[model samples]
Target chain A: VQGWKQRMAAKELARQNMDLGFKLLKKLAFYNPGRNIFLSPLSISTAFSMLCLGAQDSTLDEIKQGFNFRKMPEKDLHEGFHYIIHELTQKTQDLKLSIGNTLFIDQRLQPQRKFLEDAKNFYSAETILTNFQNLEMAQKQINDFISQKTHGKINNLIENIDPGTVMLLANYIFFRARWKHEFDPNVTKEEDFFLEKNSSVKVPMMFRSGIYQVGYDDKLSCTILEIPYQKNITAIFILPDEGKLKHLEKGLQVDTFSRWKTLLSRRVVDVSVPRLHMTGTFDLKKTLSYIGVSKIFEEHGDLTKIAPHRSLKVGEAVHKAELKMDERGTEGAAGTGMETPLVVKIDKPYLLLIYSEKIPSVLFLGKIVNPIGK
Target chain B: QGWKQRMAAKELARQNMDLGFKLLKKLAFYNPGRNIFLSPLSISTAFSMLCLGAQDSTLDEIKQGFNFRKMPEKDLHEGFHYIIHELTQKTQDLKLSIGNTLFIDQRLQPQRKFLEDAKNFYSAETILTNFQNLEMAQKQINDFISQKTHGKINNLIENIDPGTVMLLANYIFFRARWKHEFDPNVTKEEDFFLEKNSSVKVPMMFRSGIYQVGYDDKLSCTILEIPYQKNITAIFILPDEGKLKHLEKGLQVDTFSRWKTLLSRRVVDVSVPRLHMTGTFDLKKTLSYIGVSKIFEEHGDLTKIAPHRSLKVGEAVHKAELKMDERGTEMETPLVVKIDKPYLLLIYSEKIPSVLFLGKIVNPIGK
Candidate 1:
């Protein structure tokens, strides 16, 4: 049944995609330790790859290296992204899943037509025109489009914006499906969830007793549980005994995960896990820079291919993701975007006001550049 | 700190056992070798609060049962103040809490001293409820108990009547892990015998320790003390090597004093049958046989509690549950992997073979 998973480059493609996924996880989890980290690497990489289409010089090289796509041919790199996106889009019977990439640029800048068509033809990303000069309207336009694409699971993708923010490169992935066996609500009751502080919170815990794939890594002192959703989608639960969570997390790699898959056997287990809804909003600009993709967000950034006549710099970058899991199944959302502002000179004499939202008063400011208190 | 408190409340603590052992001998007599578990500390606390509001012979009836004839009433409540506060201290391994509450009808106002002393000494809180509204009244009392126990006990009061005047409640929550923890890996299903030749298989945990073991020639039983954290210990009395007999009838404060004296530290093997038991008792009639009778009768004096109208305990119900195992946990029915702690969960699709959702459930309420 799983033999269809074998194809020459499809295998290499998935292997490559999976490597990038864990690499990003490694970087992301590093920056934010001791907090819940949840995001779609597929969405991030696809979105980043779309942005890389316009990045020139070593800008694209650094971005590709940061994406873990440096060694693979650039032709296959783009093709693989297209292939995986297409394959995930085609999977709809057992579950509903969709991946999207869009370029929401302000009308003030005109990108090279070749870069625009390449994004449309290769990555299948849409380019929507929104006036970023009206900050609230622009924020709403981008967030509303993302909200609709994610089925409203991700609403506030863009929080507050500035008029100088000329572009919002966006990507989103949505998924919802039913579990293979629904947890009986009759058995769901108030139970304790122990915390790190040796305290507990009572939560409605769902339980099921049946044959599922389960394994224990004695070395790691953790149990691996796999419960299926419909035909092929499975939920793998890794429960570390007591304080062994960080140790288990440190060992989250492809080979470690694959070994767990091999180690799991069909066994009857009394499974109990909580029903939860989690959302994560990340600053990917800083995160990507930490992993050596810093050029795009810098002053000397070379993103000239996307817009040949503009002096561009990324204004802000954020990734918003959420996940809801219950007795029925899972509903997921991940919408990502970043700002790239074009050059607007203040070299000519300009007036500036330093204001406060708290007191709604101007403290003091008189911007008369290169002038002696005129 | 709680150990030193044992000295502070020594006199009352001993009186507590004196009351507790006699209550057990009376209350548990019909069951023979069957399981019996109750919190005499709770019964005593709730009863002492009743004695506080006691007037005339009503106070003496409860007092004589407690054998505090010449003891000052102020000292008695103060002793409980220390005992209740001390024993309720939570340590890494010990968690014991004792609380008392009086649910009075909305029509009656309890005396200010009774309310203040109940709170000041016993830490008992009173709520004036509409007893005519049975559901709300019952719910209000049980909610207090369930919260007091930190969700260990629920539905302590399942039902109450519309005409009820006052209902007294006291709850004890205690969980202590073994000083030397049980290795569940070595535990096995062994047959536990009862007096009627009936036996059931239970998960019996085994460990060897420097236990206080003794043999009583008079009673023909081996007494073993399995120590727990916070200096608390569980005493085991096995009769005639296997077949059950009754040393239980003679189980009293004096008899326990002799056992304590006779016990000596020796290396001993212990097989403890893991089980969870709950005992809910209506002690109105049970105490009446012991002369603490009128507190539940119409002739009872509750004038000190309320001078406006009459009030007496409508029901004297006490519920206590004990769960002990290798780690000092719970029971038998099916194999259980209680996801009691924070757990890591993942949602992966084998077809795509990617982790869809990776998360941790530390406190579900944190969501």
Candidate 2:
């Protein structure tokens, strides 16, 4: 049974890696109207590789590997990461991922369940290597994992992840939102911030007052604050004063609509906060190598696993997040850029999961984004 | 005389460590960067504790065990070995990569063989092979430095034995640069003295500003701290009055710390200082003066530690070096003091090392 479990676990890992890889490709090819994605292809590639690759390891190792603290191969590591990103960009499109990683990557909450609504005989678990299954739930799990691994500071980048995905690769980003009403630099003053054990630090605190959409959730006993960034995209902060955050975490159920509803309050509390900006990045190298993808970096490692004619090695995988917070909600930004030339997305909800006319042939067979060993 | 100088160097180290310990606590407390201030103090304290552990001592019993002669034979070797091991462990824990080069006389090259042996014993690489030409020499030094830094810093060391061949090379470096840039001009000539009696002309650059300087009345040495804008500082010292260090007088670390905190916003000047300084020291006499007499006695307990641990009461050696001329704006004009005489004696008092005992002695140990 243990041997079977290990085999199942390995097989499950590969399947999950596929879902995650696809979701990452979605974010990698995502483009913004006013921003130039090409300006920092290398950066985009790094963040994308990490987000997708993070799925291969436990949350702890992912965070540690992301920091890259010890003197390691940075250039080659970064370049290898970008190679994966280039591939992701070509294979996927319309995927909008936000920015940041490592000590700074923020996890975001996005609208999920849309993918599950379009799948066949959807089960949160117990699903086999079916031909077509939306990985939105898996993507959501990816975001939650990355966020928990980095602490709550990383959130706000993702919009949604579909439910009931057997395997998934998803990343969420939450940057500390900068003050919506920007702090008057002239007004910033040195204030004593209470630290651990009666110790205080004198830091320049930025302050501003602006109208905000606020709510309180009695079930969670926390406040949810939302500050808009450019358009509909908003930075959200789940503020639970002091000891209440733990209570909120325990009681808050995943995918509870009422939980989000109760969080909205009509009145805004006068808020002043310290300006903190954090950036984090993670290299999915060790984790990927551990998951039977080690040959890309090695000289003689065979690249014959994925495709016969393509002859490709896993170039690099990386994910990055950047955030800034002051008196407002958390801002989440992330990006993925890879080097893979071919990208094929086979899953799209059409007429129905069983109908061929409703979806592509690739969707029925799940050939385009099929689970390994299917 | 060289043996006597080496003993003096050991004495100076003892004084330095003792005095530094006291002042470091105060200065570190005042520092805004809590991490920087605390780490060094913690490491030093840990080192002392390790020494205590090896000698079956504790913090409460430190003063008793630190005494050179009153110390038991086995305790002394154990303490020394423990301290060395502690230093090594701390270096690794602190994530610090350190390199060292000591410019020894041609005669001391033979002594390097011992260090090479120690390196082999430690299962580490000793890349000190002889290079016949300048190109090969530069390449070898650069490779060594690159390997030490894990490629973070390249070409850090150079010219183990330059053709001018004044001495063997010894250099130690740690940390990385915040930023890097270079400048060519402002490196001109000025007047330098050949000891107190003679004069020589050399290119000198002048710079002025607020600097971390220390006035140690005991050693009559002025300590200068030149910051490199990041996690490193270059500490330079100018001998007091003339070029002599007298042991009867000693500098307290509190005084040194006080000097360190001095924010002197004065017009400073400096010569394009020579990067190399040479000294030959005698270790035995100086050690005796510092109360380290038990180790030299026939009944002393160095035997259990290393059978080769014998003091010939003769010459021991070391070297001093700087690479100031090559590095540009990284270290600017810290203070302005006229170069009237060669106050640049390699060692002060019995701690001073002359030419004969370069590599043969270990008292001038750095890094």
Candidate 3:
């Protein structure tokens, strides 16, 4: 009974955080409606949960709103992340999903003992006491920690550092698993991925045709398909009808996603998606301020829980997320043949969500408008 | 002067527009890569004349089929009576004719009240004919339509069924000169793309000037306005090569008005093909496809038509034809919009606010 209750709290927390993720995605896309955007919801939300341990007053309240957990008690919020992080790091043989919340504390500010213990307890996070006076050394140490924790998938995330920083926060999410049904690389070939009616980029597109969970939403005019991995992890690829991406973006709520999950049934469809690998980075100090999570970055911020001092507000928050896919895997479901009556091709701008089946959460999500760039 | 009369007038026109579009879509898309041209108003009027005396379940179905389910039966005639009168007198430069004619077998005479109501509302004419003489009956029917349409539509009834008790016919002949006429000096033959394997050289007309144009993002098509002399306009729609099927998304009368809000006068480089197209459809068969089945089936009755109580519309045919008069410039590289392939055309009456004719031009075959 105790275990189930803990899991239930973690599950509800994931759902709330998924709402936060979509809002963050909306703000990200609003900057440029057409751009390759990738962000890890778990990565950003986990880091914010860790920072709240050191925040006080309205700063804590503002963080909770941005967290999409305005009603959640402080105690329950921390415990939820603890269980979520604990369960995810318990890697199985086939799946390796690594997440880390690392804090770099400037040696000048003596952090309170309770803050360090709580960060470690709830976030499974590491608090690094570094000499930020030596900016180059601090950056090197931070990137090394990020690289090793994410299993070497990301590097140079901290390209430069703010010397006026009290504490620099960084986090990352990396997922790895062989596809349950591998794309037939033998049939993969160069094809045009349309960005506009007149503009396109030639990319090597992956192909597979078999029984897969597929859905077409008439209201949003989007097609959704599920691509599963060895474990319960799956990729939900959404293709909006041409010129309807804005509508999909407007209506993508947690309820919208739940209905899509409910409506999809296994159907034999030919799927074509570009073989893509890309990274997205956000300056939380900039993006977070616009979304009502700004107090912690201001000089008057009450981060006294980190230290019994007034001039202790953190200066910089950075997050980098990486997504990769290729054609090496185990046997897929048996397919009828090459020809199919229906084909769902992502030969245009589309959104993708890397989802965890067990936790039922969005790990990372973004739109791929152009696959060949920054 | 008041909103009531002005309101009902617009409402009646909108009602006609929606029903006409439904009929056009049903007929326009009965396709396999061919040209289509028809006047939905013509069909609606003739069908109204025949259903003037329909009773009970058949009357209800008749109203449902023509999209007048919510309209009061008493008001229907007066609506068409006003619409037909308003259409022809809208402008001087426009030469338009709309006629509904019924040819009943001499043996069965229609009710006096039905014929009087039809004539009053629809300006309909009843002609007695020996439909048992199939060949002669067919010629008489075709001749009447030809005379009304100025010979543009002839041989509409290629063969009248020998067993037919009555034949109903509707016809429209519309001609208007362009407000901004195409300069024939710039007419040049260019290849119109049909497919990678097929193409046709056509006399493409060009005009470069500011025009009312808009793009329907939802339907993924372009709508360019070509005005006729006075308060009339021809809306030429060109969809992205394979998106001709998407035009139906923007077909509703309300949705079309939304499209008008998006149009603005901007400099455009335009080229349109000078082509002719003709369409033929058997209304008895096509109307059935669109929920208007009672009139054709033996079970239903046009009982108001004759005392015999078996007066069903035996045969109905529609024939329509169109010819465009072979009739611009640089600055900001003017948006060059070319109707170089399959496209759609709509003739709209501004004052009446009715879609006079709607068609899909797939192949521009020269005569």
Candidate 4:
């Protein structure tokens, strides 16, 4: 009984950590608000956690606070992520999801033994010895590693490498799942997609109808719908009423998400979703600085754990993600891809969050303002 | 000169100016997946003004590089003076302002001839400041530029290093409304295809009117012209998919003239995204790419401008800003020229026939 209580307490802290990650994701969504935006908070947090292993003093404190790790003990915080990553990778049966971390250290400096051991034991990060003198070759090697890890979805995450860079930390996550209920490609047709109040373009929208977990938020004047994938993965779609997108955006919170989940009851409805393919890349320096992880980029950065004698700073944090959805499913799907009833058209700018039951946080979160591409 | 000889001289001067425009384009505007906004006229004017102080082989290189060797020196300077005055003409339909400034170090005395040429022909508002106090001089120059451009431009010079003596600067500001007012109610969200596999949703403005459009099979591009009040106009070029790379390489002054003749007025549906952009570029590299490097080095002879000063041109910075929207009070007829893909825009004077502002819009939001 005591062990059960401790496990529950750890799970609560894990949930809080995810809430903080969501908070950072909301702030970053404002970078280009009107366009389609997609990001993996899990990927960003994991990358920063690896970097945090090398940080010391105020830098480490700032990073920990930014990721909502101040309340938990340092050992427990890393251990929590260790369990999450372990569970996520333990199963590879139904879904095609992969998460990887790597450390490209400058050959001039020797890495600390304890730091390398912790990284290997906790995060399973592969360390590489690189010569920054040959910048082109180093760039290519890092890019090639990312490309192979993400199955070529992200080709080149690191574009230009600064010659002064002492260390580079890269983290990548790729998720592709066959939906439990697939759309009928035969019923797919071109529909008018509203770009804004006065414009629209014809787009190929996929159609499926059946009992879906959906509810209406009277406060936000929007509808929330959830679609399930094969292996505990689900995509929650939030459709705002006409011209009420601002209210929905401002009302985003972890509590609100939980409330929507509670309110959503199974109901028969028709869903028209646009076939979307999007790729987003961000340089996390400015975005991280906006959320209080700034000292690591400055001259005061103390990454003594990685190399005590050498001056080191995080040179770049490049993240790239691709999301592709279509009318396809794996063998032995549970339900036939077919349906009836009240219409729920995802024709305009809508919010989407891809969550996994196996993980503690959002796998992918973004807005689909236009289904064509961004 | 007789009438025939005078006509030939004017044609020769115009051709030389076109050559300079082509040279500038080739050096800039080649980066993919990015937006490029530049003022060729503003950059050319600043470099030509600097040439007034150069002497011997240095001056000769600039002259040949800028295609100014064919025209007499007096004609070139006077023609530039005429162009500047004509462009700055006061008009209510469009808000346009152009200004030039030359900051000379108070320690050195400039040649009397250079000063007269700068003041009389270039109409430069000159200032003599103590470069020894670099911080004060830098702030004053930036402040003056911002004020002169009506707050449209700021921080024209980021930092001034020690030993920097003379700084030459010019800026342009433009704001205009559409001829046919686009109903903001009709402004809707649409997909702006940036590439074969990429797109972005933007608030695109829509209207229907009779527009002058042309099709170039050789380049696989379609050109459309949207007129502003008075004689100013904005030309938009929409290239076929996988064809923008080719169209950009073939862009030149003669292409503009050829496109103008090819444009025929017809009714078409028009859609353009709301664009508000400000771009800044340092001309040192682009200028150096076009054989303007001698003056930037230590050994170059700038002896004619400031007689005994052993100074080199350190930096050349260009800043330009433009705002386009549908605040016009007029209404027009219906046509179709929907610009939904990645396109290029060039704003120029109908009467002067020179490209003043050049831009590319890959995404409507931020670059």
Give the Cα lDDT of each candidate. Answer: 0.61, 0.32, 0.77, 0.73
lDDT of 3 by residue, A275-336 (tens): 87778878888778667888878876478888766777767788888777777566735644
Give the TM-score, chain B only, in order for the candidates. 0.82, 0.42, 0.90, 0.88
| TM-score, second chain, candidate 4 | 0.88
Where does candidate 4 stray beyond 4 Å? A1-10, A90-93, A330-340, A358-360, B1-367
**Which portions of model 3 miss their true places by more than 4 Å?**
A90-93, A332-341, B1-367
Residue runs of model 2 more than 4 Å from their true location after superposition: A1-211, A215-224, A227-234, A237-266, A269-314, A322-374, B1-57, B62-205, B208-235, B238-269, B272-367
What TM-score against the true fold does each predicted structure earn?
A: 0.45, 0.27, 0.49, 0.49
Question: Model 4: per-residue lDDT, tens digit, B1-367?
Answer: 3344344334433554465456435644545567766666666567677778887777887787777787677666766676666667555577766666878788877778888888776677667767888866875676466445534454467677667887777777677766777888898988887777777888888877788887998889999888887677888999988888788778776777688778887887888888877767666666665777776666648877777647667665776667777766574556566788878888877655556677777776765
Q: Find the 10 residues in a row with the least total lDDT in model 2 chain B.
A: B353-362
lDDT ranking from best candidate downward: 3, 4, 1, 2
Error of 2 at A117 (Å): 45
lDDT of 1 by residue, B1-367 (tens): 4443344366666666666666666655554433446676667778887877887777888888866664678777777787677666677676666767788888887889888888988888888877878866765665456545644555567666546878877666556787688888988777654323555555667876677677778777666666666556666665554322355466666776798777876766666666455566776765764678778766648877877435678876776655566774221222112222222222211221221112222222221
lDDT of 4 by residue, A279-320 (tens): 667777877876778777665648878876546877766776
The clash number for model 4 is: 13
Candidate 3 vs candidate 4: which has greater lDDT?
3
The sequence of per-residue lDDT tens digits that candidate 2 reaches over residues A1-374 is: 43443333323322333333333323322322111111122233333333332222333233324333112233333333333222222211212223233211112212123322211111111111211133433333343444444344333223332232122222223323223244456666666544323544565555544455566567555555554543223444454443453343333332332357555644434444444443333344433433334433332223222122232223333434433444442233322112212211111110000001111110100101111110
Compute the interface RMSD for each candidate structure: 17.9, 16.7, 38.5, 20.3
Clashing residue pairs in candidate 1, if any?
A315-A339
DockQ of 2: 0.01
lDDT (10s digit) by residue, model 1, range A2-114: 42332333446555555555566566666666455556665677778877778877778878777777767767667766765655553454566666677777787887798
Q: Better model by lDDT, 1 or 4?
A: 4
lDDT of 4: 0.73
DockQ of each model vs. true complex? 0.01, 0.01, 0.00, 0.01
